[PDB]
From a paper:
[name] ([name]) is a mitochondrial membrane–associated metabolic enzyme, which catalyzes the oxidation of l-2-hydroxyglutarate (l-2-HG) to 2-oxoglutarate (2-OG). [name] belongs to the d-amino acid oxidase (DAAO) family of the FAD-dependent proteins. Like other members of the DAAO family, dmL2HGDH is composed of the FAD-binding domain and the substrate-binding domain. The active site of dmL2HGDH is located at the interface of the FAD-binding domain and the substrate-binding domain and is composed of residues from both domains.
Crystallization of dmL2HGDH in the absence of any ligands yielded crystals in FAD-bound form (dmL2HGDHFAD) and in complex with FAD and SO42− (dmL2HGDHFAD+SO4) in which SO42− was derived from the crystallization solution. Structures of dmL2HGDH in FAD-bound form and in complex with FAD and SO42− or 2-OG were determined at resolutions of 2.85 Å, 2.30 Å, and 2.82 Å, respectively. In the dmL2HGDHFAD+SO4 structure, there is a SO42− anion bound at the substrate-binding site, which occupies a similar position as the C1-carboxyl of 2-OG and makes similar interactions with the surrounding residues except for Leu299. In all structures, there are four dmL2HGDH monomers forming a tetramer in the asymmetric unit. In each monomer, there are an FAD bound at the active site and a detergent molecule n-dodecyl-β-d-maltopyranoside (DDM) on a surface groove. The DDM molecule is derived from the purification buffer with its hydrophilic head lying on the protein surface and the hydrophobic tail pointing to the interior of the protein, which might stabilize the structure. In all structures, an FAD molecule is bound at the FAD-binding site, which adopts an elongated conformation with the isoalloxazine moiety pointing toward the substrate-binding site and forming extensive hydrophilic and hydrophobic interactions with the surrounding residues.
Residue numbers in the entry:
A (entry chain D): 42 to 221, 223 to 454
B (entry chain A): 38 to 217, 219 to 409, 413 to 450
C (entry chain B): 41 to 220, 223 to 454
D (entry chain C): 41 to 219, 224 to 412, 419 to 454
The structure:
């Protein structure tokens, strides 16, 4: 049936399958997606921001992939004529304690060759953002916005135009060895009789990458810990208050960039996302929990270790979500004239945050295969984590994943 | 934009929208479905059985709808060349107390003109199911199996071929009196600028029929109480032990038919469905809990009343679900050589069980309308069971209702 | 100091054993440690008040003789101390022919156990004993009576104190240590400086017998699983409808006798007790949950095995407890003119039900000691379980325990 | 079994009030009912054991006067009855310049309350009183002391019995009925009744529940706040000599986790203020579903939570993870580690809350059966001001019931 099957129709799975068929036009490739459309999850519930590569440690692959992907993204958006807006970014420091870290971000930004990075303070802050306070600001004019869900759909259309097959409504449930065939791996869906046979498998399952890796025989670690990213909607009567992206100076101990003011493609102004621990892999709303997710995430050895040191930051995120009057006061340090009457609760996304046994939040590439003999081992590779930000670096991530499965499966 | 809009892409919403455009080929009709495809919920997570109409009280509309819908369905499957199998059904009794209840089902099935219902003695059971036990059984040779999701999609294509528009990914969130116009009702989705104008609306929202009715001004009752229906997967090494449908003798006090043996179009044998109270409206996943949906299901004044009488039967369902060994012990009364190692927990559906203030499990049509939006939005908050088998007959009923209600034609 | 022997537990078993030993050996210096500020605050003070005759128990067993002997010892002790009691009698009523088969099994065990004046009663003779009670056949035990077992326990204590024994109320035993020489065991209370030294220790800690046994190195099994026993009160206007004890025919697979009609000493008629799994060791109130004692009742290996067979029997007890109307319908099989409006919710007790690793509800004697040769392993004996019924069998249990520690500790 | 007045509650407030009223009116037949089998089983027997001096409280208010007078009456009572105490001075230590301004506020309020002999003490001077303690500035209250308040409560009850009062232990007041003595009080045991002309309630953690039994509004509700203590190892008890208190947030009635010696020489660290999920929830795992539902559904709860949830979560997190509590304590005693502390006992504060979310710290009296008065709250600190609180309650009883 297929030489290679990619499980996962997100932006990482779609860009991977697209990059693979472009390199190898004779390879019969399929994509299996449990939902009925691409980019239903992480790739369709994001900030829509095209990152430039400021915060990332210089000389590392993460810093390279973001700057790589950003230029590859803008070029791809021009090639396919996908709408986008280069709104620019302002990382605003509110006190002299945040300018010590802001200057560190300036050094990292320049070393990563972020285009046109410049530090700014005084009245120049109100030149870019007339309603924004702040001691000192970092200006990144090439940070833009886009619909990453629409981009993912274009990845799938490019994949199909090269002969690729996309199976929507295909919930991968089990892998089995084919009867003694040239396609030794059959993939089973949740619907009876729904199967697909293949030589090799790559999985890009986002919020369920650890669960997918277990069905091949991989260890439970790194576990995917869901972090809900909630957004607030600024009222249309005050959408003029922000023009581009206004980011805070975040704590560099964590990969999160903090709650930020970001315009959407349709003109809306979204405030977020935050980082509240979800009690469900797809916990898009508060109170939508899964008890197996609760009992297993709390008993995961890495969980207690991270909470032992960073319980305060997580509780502060949840408290500011429970009572948005605490959130708007944090937002008034940047835009003071926003009140509780100007914001409403908006939609949310869920980060697939990888975590090791020590409690560290994994931000590197993690590829994994089972420990069998063995047909389901050796032939099923699981991409359990890709470096952030996955949407901006998607085209650069795809080239790394294409190299990985080429060396792992002897293709080309 | 449209004259009538049907909210709900399930089998009941699709069949009604298809029936009304076939009766009135000049009506501009649309379908709004919050998901990305049709039959994503009840119509796509069912037992796949074409019921014959045995259990239902003679003379009632429910009894007529199931036998008529069953005949209309088989004609539609032949008409569209949709795959199906007439596997037949056995309703097996295991002791003599169950025999009395079985004899009542024979009288009802004969009064309902179920063709061709016959009672067989325990010796003749193995002529139909060689591995099944039992002292007596009711034999329904025309009970069948089908992919109701594929049938629901064919309803939509028929609807599309007649000129109807299907809006997928349209999560109806608000109804609005149109500002200006010949289309007084506006329907708002969850996305900005996602609207559709209409003259009349019919909702068939399944698990959210009560929440949809509330948006017009209808009372919170009857409430939709979700009942999870779990399925067990039998290994292929024992699939040969079940030829057709093997059903137990159920308690006539409830609308549930019990955990049964049923082949899929796959040929694989599924054991179910369950009848476990769900802690979430769309609680397909086992441990999924919604605190709002659970606290509202338990604070509903009808919940404590029905639980005060029948919580024992509900508790027996969950313990057999918690401990599969107890469910295996029950199924061995029919197929003895099946152990716990022969099964695996499979997917589940969620029944949209309507319930009034008195705790009754409503099992008939419930239409509702506000006290603009009150006269032009009709909500079908419940339809008679079984919805899939009777879908074509239910749609004829529903088309009759909105034809009189909205003066269509 | 201090003492030769210390009995931990001020219940009816610890008090009776301590009373029996000082009577056998008047020169022995014995003390009783009880954590509450009074005797018999738990099981011995929250019971049905019934003096059992010894009908249900297997002939030839030690449990069968202890209850028959204990009942004769109890009435003799009650007369001697002028403690008020009432020989109300007991009717074990069968309602169908299946319970009739189980009833004559009970009668034959009662005859073999030498239960005095046991007579099988039939049809209309039932109304001569209980005019308002129905049934198809009943077993009549005229010598089954009622008493305040809590008052009996305090009488054991005053007998103990009159013979020179010391009672330490408000002494919560926290740990045993070696006195590094005339009294090698030191017992520590909760408050610092609250210590007592002795040569040998017997524990009768009821709901915490397993927790006490772990403190000197014994295994966690058999673990005490708490079963709340709830009672309902009949309105005074209908007390006349119940003259004596009216019991149902129980399932012999379980130690529990069913919900029964029992008059109290003040003329009250109590309906109970049931057998509902407590979510807390001392869970006398519904809703009182202890996360530790709950999460360790489950996850205990014997629990899931026991539930995998009998979960339905426990849930029916719960369903009738939550919905009193379901309990009244079952009680109407015996007394029909009793409605839901005629009853009130009353107090509850909690059974200290021992459970082995296989999931069996242990109902016999269980002793335990440390696994070494040191002071703690050799000088501390734990009674992890006493046979049912503990209150009726107390005087007989005491002589067995007295015989046991006489051999184990070379006393006398 | 018949009495003129019955006091429900055998804590320090109920015992001191019953003692005060029989001393004023020796012919009044008075009884006290206590549901436990001993006095001072709860708040009065699970406290910091500190005799406060009256530093934090606003001058001119009833709180500031009752504590200063109460501690003077307490010291005189302890000397008269020969009850052991130690008189280990207090040190309220500020650790940053942002804390010295709040400490100066406590000094101005302390001198206005006439706390002897309050004196602001500078950084170099801190080691002269606590050699191991850090700080940039501190407030020295040498007359603050320690005592076993449970032993004091039992001495109140003995004075009450010596004057002819009857103490009914193991008497769980469950119901009030009309019966001379028109009020009949029922216990939980069969046939356990007393009759009386008037009733006074001092039910601590169940004061709001007792007020409901006679038909009073459910507000103010008692919200339980568990107060956990940590135990310093014996090897480092020499590192603190007396009370070492921090500079607390003046918006709340809590004084914060502090270093405090006990009568046996032990050093206890606490108490914190974590929301308990049970009225008598002395341990973290011990919760009550009913006494969790209603505390959340109480209209005042979410109002206070919407403003100060961060302070409650900070308390809980430091309780869940000891390392975070140690880092806070190291600002005062730097050379202690997790190996130097162990988890200790806990108390539960009967914190009264109004419908607006305010933590009530004043007197609250509630009449119904019009012969039943419920003291739903007494001002803090209840133990130190016990004898002063009793006189006020005695005045209220004499005017409400016309005794004398
Ligand atoms: C709140 C939020 C905001 C973000 N903002 C930005 C931003 O501004 N800029 C940026 O560059 N990045 C951003 N990101 C990151 C970006 O969204 C992700 O890195 C990226 O979407 C990851 O893509 P993915 O395909 O790996 O995950 P997904 O998009 O979630 O893809 C996983 C897919 O696998 C499918 N799947 C899972 N299990 C199975 C199975 N068993 N069978 C079949 N299919 C299965 C799922 O249905 C899903 O479609 C944001 C992320 C979040 C959470
Ligand atoms: C476990 C199970 C087994 C069954 N087995 C059988 C069987 O063997 N035989 C048989 O005949 N019947 C069977 N049934 C019954 C049958 O499946 C249902 O009666 C039938 O599918 C009901 O159709 P429906 O369209 O009303 O429900 P649904 O299919 O649930 O349709 C509701 C639709 O409304 C949509 N919707 C809801 N809210 C909104 C909104 N705000 N905006 C837009 N769209 C919205 C939902 O997305 C959904 O697609 C079974 C049912 C269950 C639960
Ligand atoms: C609901 C119910 C009804 C019953 N009805 C009857 C009946 O009708 N007839 C009959 O014959 N029997 C009856 N029984 C059985 C009888 O009540 C018990 O078998 C018996 O009372 C148990 O005696 P015990 O002293 O071992 O238990 P307990 O009375 O519980 O004594 C244990 C004591 O040890 C103390 N303790 C525990 N840990 C420590 C520690 N660390 N330090 C100090 N002290 C400690 C406890 O505080 C307690 O006082 C009934 C039991 C129950 C639960
Ligand atoms: C952790 C903590 C530390 C403290 N530290 C200090 C300190 O250092 N200095 C200081 O001055 N103060 C301190 N306090 C305050 C002091 O302990 C209390 O203010 C004081 O004990 C209140 O006394 P009370 O009698 O009102 O409460 P309680 O002592 O709780 O008395 C209430 C009594 O009523 C009884 N009761 C309740 N319901 C019924 C019923 N239905 N029938 C019969 N009886 C019933 C209870 O059994 C209980 O004995 C502290 C408090 C806490 C919680
Ligand atoms: C297991 C449970 C424990 C949870 C595990 C640890 C969770 C850690 C969460 C990391 C926090 C999310 O990221 C955090 O976002 C906040 C909120 O914007 C940022 O905070 C920043 O911006 C906000 C406004 O947005 C300002 O008011 C604030 O003064 C400033 O610090 C932090 O600089 C950043 O670190
Ligand atoms: C909301 C809380 C309270 C819940 C409310 C009550 C829920 C009602 C559920 C009714 C039970 C479901 O339907 C019930 O299915 C079971 C299981 O097949 C049938 O049971 C029958 O078949 C099974 C095999 O499956 C046999 O082992 C069993 O002996 C026989 O009685 C019952 O006859 C039928 O009544
Ligand atoms: C921990 C989870 C699993 C729980 C473990 C299993 C618990 C088992 C408890 C056994 C039940 C208690 O004991 C059980 O009481 C019931 C109810 O009175 C008795 O029932 C009997 O009397 C009652 C009236 O009281 C009648 O309505 C009934 O028809 C008759 O059978 C049973 O004969 C007896 O077996
Ligand atoms: C119901 C949910 C919401 C809960 C409601 C809000 C609860 C508020 C509780 C108030 C906090 C308890 O009291 C609080 O104790 C802490 C910890 O000692 C004190 O904190 C002080 O001392 C600690 C060490 O002890 C120092 O590390 C700290 O820098 C200093 O501020 C606060 O000054 C005081 O305000």
């Amino acid at each position: 049936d297929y030489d290679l099957v990619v499980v996962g129709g997100g932006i990482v799975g779609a860009a991977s399958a697209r990059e693979i068929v472009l390199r190898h036009p004779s390879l019969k490739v399929a994509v299996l997606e449990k939902e009925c459309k691409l980019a239903k999850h992480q790739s369709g519930h994001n900030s829509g921001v095209i990152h430039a590569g400021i915060y990332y440690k210089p000389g590392t692959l993460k810093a390279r992939l973001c700057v790589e992907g950003m230029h590859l993204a803008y070029a791809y958006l021009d090639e396919k004529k996908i709408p986008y807006k280069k709104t620019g970014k302002l990382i605003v420091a509110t006190d002299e304690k945040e300018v010590k870290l802001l200057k560190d971000l300036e050094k990292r930004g320049i070393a990563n060759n972020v285009p046109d990075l410049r530090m700014i303070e005084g009245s120049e802050i109100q030149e870019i953002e007339p309603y924004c306070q702040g001691v000192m600001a970092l200006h990144s004019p090439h940070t833009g916005i886009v619909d990453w869900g629409l981009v993912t759909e274009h990845y799938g259309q490019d994949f199909k135009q090269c002969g690729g097959d996309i199976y929507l409504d295909f919930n991968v449930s089990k892998f089995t060895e084919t009867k003694e065939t040239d396609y030794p791996v059959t993939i089973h869906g949740a619907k009876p009789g729904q199967t697909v046979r293949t030589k090799n498998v790559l999985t890009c399952g986002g919020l369920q990458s650890d669960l997918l890796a277990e069905k091949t025989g991989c260890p439970r670690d790194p576990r995917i810990v869901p972090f809900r990213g909630e957004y607030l909607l600024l009222t249309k009567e005050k959408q003029h208050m922000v023009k581009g992206n206004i980011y805070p100076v975040p704590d560099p101990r964590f990969p999160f960039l903090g709650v930020h003011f970001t315009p959407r493609m349709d003109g809306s102004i979204w405030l977020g996302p935050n980082a509240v621990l979800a009690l469900k892999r797809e916990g898009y709303t508060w109170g939508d929990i899964n008890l197996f997710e609760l009992f297993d995430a709390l008993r995961y050895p890495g969980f207690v270790k991270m909470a032992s040191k960073y319980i305060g930051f997580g509780l502060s995120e949840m408290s500011k979500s429970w009572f948005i009057n605490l959130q708007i006061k944090a937002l008034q340090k940047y835009i003071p004239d926003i009140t509780e009457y100007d914001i409403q609760r908006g939609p949310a996304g869920v980060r697939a945050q990888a975590m090791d046994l020590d409690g560290n939040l994994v931000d590197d590439f993690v590829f994994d295969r089972g420990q069998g003999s063995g047909a389901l081992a050796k032939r099923v590779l699981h991409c359990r984590n890709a470096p952030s930000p996955g949407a901006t670096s998607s085209l650069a991530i795809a080239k790394m994943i294409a190299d990985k499965i080429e060396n792992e499966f002897s293709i080309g």
